Amino acid sequence: TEQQRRELDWEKTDGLMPVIVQHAVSGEVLMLGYMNPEALDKTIESGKVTFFSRTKQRLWIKGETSGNFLNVVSIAPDCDNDTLLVLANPIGPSSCFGNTAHQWLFLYQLEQLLAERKYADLYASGTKRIAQKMGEEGVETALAATVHDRFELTNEASDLMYHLLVLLQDQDLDLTTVIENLHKR
Amino acid sequence: LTEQQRRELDWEKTDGLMPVIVQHAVSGEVLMLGYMNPEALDKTIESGKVTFFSRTKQRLWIKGETSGNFLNVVSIAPDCDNDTLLVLANPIGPTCHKGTSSCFGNTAHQWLFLYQLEQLLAERKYADPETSYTAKLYASGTKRIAQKMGEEGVETALAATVHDRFELTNEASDLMYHLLVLLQDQDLDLTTVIENLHKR
Numbered sequence: 367t368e369q370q371r372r373e374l375d376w377e378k379t380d381g382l383m384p385v386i387v388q389h390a391v392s393g394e395v396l397m398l399g400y401m402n403p404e405a406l407d408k409t410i411e412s413g414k415v416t417f418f419s420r421t422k423q424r425l426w427i428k429g430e431t432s433g434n435f436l437n438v439v440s441i442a443p444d445c446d447n448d449t450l451l452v453l454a455n456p457i458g459p460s461s462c463f464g465n466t467a468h469q470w471l472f473l474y475q476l477e478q479l480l481a482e483r484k485y486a487d488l489y490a491s492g493t494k495r496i497a498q499k500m501g502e503e504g505v506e507t508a509l510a511a512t513v514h515d516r517f518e519l520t521n522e523a524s525d526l527m528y529h530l531l532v533l534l535q536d537q538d539l540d541l542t543t544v545i546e547n548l549h550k551r
Numbered sequence: 552l553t554e555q556q557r558r559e560l561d562w563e564k565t566d567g568l569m570p571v572i573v574q575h576a577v578s579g580e581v582l583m584l585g586y587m588n589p590e591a592l593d594k595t596i597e598s599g600k601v602t603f604f605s606r607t608k609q610r611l612w613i614k615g616e617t618s619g620n621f622l623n624v625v626s627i628a629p630d631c632d633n634d635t636l637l638v639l640a641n642p643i644g645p646t647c648h649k650g651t652s653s654c655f656g657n658t659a660h661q662w663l664f665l666y667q668l669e670q671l672l673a674e675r676k677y678a679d680p681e682t683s684y685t686a687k688l689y690a691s692g693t694k695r696i697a698q699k700m701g702e703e704g705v706e707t708a709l710a711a712t713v714h715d716r717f718e719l720t721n722e723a724s725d726l727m728y729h730l731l732v733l734l735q736d737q738d739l740d741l742t743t744v745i746e747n748l749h750k751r
Contacts, residue, residue, distance in 0.1 A: 384584055386572055393579025393660035398570055398635040444654030445647065449584040451655040462630035463637040468579040469742060472749045474662060497708035504704020504726070508697035511733050519737055523730065524747040526704070530723060533711050537719055542661060547724045549664045 367410075375447040376403065383450055387415060387428075389461070390439040390453035391542055392474040396461040399428070401450065406441075413438050415454055433458040477531050477541055488532055496536050499529040552596065552627050561634040562589065569636055573601060575653075576625035576639040577742055578666040582646045582653040585614070587636070599624050601640055620644040665727075669741055672731050688732050696736050699729045 374383065383406065387396045401409065402418040405425050409416040415428040415436035429435035436454035443450055467475075483489075488496060503526040510518040534540050560569060568586040575582060587595065588604040591611055595602040601614045601622035615621030622640040629636055647654050659667075675685040688696055703726040710718035734740050 384570060386581055386584060388581055388660060391661045393662055395572055395574055395581065395637055397630060398572060398584075440658045442656040442658040444583065445649070446654075449654070451581055451658060453658060453660055462632075462635075464628040466626045466628040466637060466639055468574060468639060469577045470579055470662060470666060470745060473745045476748055493714070494712050497711045500711075501704045501708035504701045504707075507704070507730070507733070508701035511697045511700075511737050512694050514693075514737065516737055516739060519734075520739060520743055520747050523734060523739070523744045526730070527744060527748060530707070530726065533707070534719075534723065537711055537714065537716055539716060539720060539723075543720055544723045544727060545662060545665045547720050548668055548727065549661070551724070 370443060370447075371406070373447050374403075374406075374443065378446075378448050382418070382420065383448070385417070385450040385452055387436060387452045387454050390455050392471060393468060394461050394471055395463065396436070396454070396456070406450075409438060409452070410441070415452060429458065473527075473541070476528075477535075480528075480531050481535050481540075484535070488529075489536065493533075493536050496529065496533045500526065500533055503529055552592075552629075556629060556633075557592075559633050560629065560636075561632065564634050568604065568606065570634070571601075571603070571636045571638055573622060573638050573640055576641050578663060579660060580653050580663055580666075581655060582622070582640070582642070583614075592636075595624060595638070596627070601638060615643070618644075618648075620646055622646070665741075668728070669731050669735075672728075673735050673740070676735060685732060688729075689736060693733075693736055696729065696733045700726070700733055703729055 381402055383401045385399050385401050387399065388394065389396060399417040400420045405416045405418040408425065412427070415438060416425055417428060418425050427435065435457045437457060439453040439455060441450055441452050503522055506522040507519065507526050510522050531541060562569065568588055569592065571585050571587050573582045573585060585603040586606065591602050591604040594611060598613065601624060602611055603614060605612050613621065621643045623643060624638060624640055626639040627636055645652055672685050675683050676689055678686040680687045680690040703722060707719065707722040707726050710722045731741060734744065
């Protein structure tokens, strides 16, 4: 970062660096904005995404007019030091690209849908009964693989994931916590 | 991209070169930022391959023209002000010029790790039993892999039932790891599972 910032190709970008902002957990791409060297210093120092208006006037912190700020987790250049990628966590309530989404994003959204259905008209049956579904789906999953029924295996693996996400939510965890736990190993 | 969407693209704001974010259509990894002129975008759409306009060489080029690493277009969409496109794409070989994947150092969104773990576990179908825990699992055969799943389902269930949030995190991690290997063992993958989940 003391090295990286000098090497930024400010000349090639006309002092206006393109910055991709991406959700730090889910990988959803949120926006492209533009940073001058000041914007980047303020971003680094504040920990909030700060841009510089291409259109006309001034630095602006993302959210300074709405409450919808982006907390920086990481910033990295590409190979030619002419684009930044910022991983950020949004605060205040998805991203500017219509309904396009990378396939695995659906698992992350599914988890959000299952969390909201705590309050619809499985969760009410209590931890033990949610747990019983995992355990019995693990059995089914094991048997379907073992007889090489790939179609059954897919559907049981799918029920297993579904129920595991519910089980995690029930105990105030989530799949992000598991994934991070795997990353630490 | 619809007819009217292309009509509304803000080419003047961008000086006739639209910024285009290229993202891996499955994993979510951001691969690169490039630029298209209108023709670059038209060939991208017609060809199914990501085609930029190199302001340096002053021509169209299909990413992969000199490396073989092409990008198969899955989807294209504008941001809400029509001055950036997002292209979801499936690479045909690894995308960046120093052997790796994307341009952006080792930074990744947190869920990318699960995708990466899966790919590691898939590579090790080759590797021989002493090369890794995974290769050893694969050599033990389907039934032993499935036994670990069933056992980890039982453990995950019990750890939840007694409200040990620490053990549940760990047992659920073990469950995920082994589930990935079992799917790979049966020539499936988590992508295929996520699709089935999506279908409901």
